[PDB]
Amino acid sequence: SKLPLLTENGGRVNRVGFTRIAREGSIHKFGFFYEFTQESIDFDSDDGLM
Amino acid sequence: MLNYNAPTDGQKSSIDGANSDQMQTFFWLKKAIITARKEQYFMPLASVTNM
């Protein structure tokens, strides 16, 4: 029922259109940290703690 | 803050949990303190007669 049939006289028939889509994506910021004192390093039993 | 705290007083360091502690809380000075032998004053005064 929707075939683009064309008669012997042509005319303004079977016009079509087109479409496009847009994708998107963003970036975000991350981070974390830890603190320590000098005594927690020098007086600790394990010298490989850091 | 990661603190050493005072392990010898029961204040654990931040790194140690409920089932951990400092392996070396003190340094052992291996030279012990000893007293000298008491002096003798009467033993040198004794003459010896063989039995």
Swiss-Prot record, chain B:
Organism: Enterobacteria phage N4 (Bacteriophage N4)
Official protein name in the record: Major capsid protein
Function: Assembles, to form an icosahedral capsid with a T=9 symmetry, about 60 nm in diameter, and consisting of 535 capsid proteins.
Domain of life, source organism: Viruses
Transmembrane segments: none
Location in the cell: Virion
Extent of the signal sequence: none
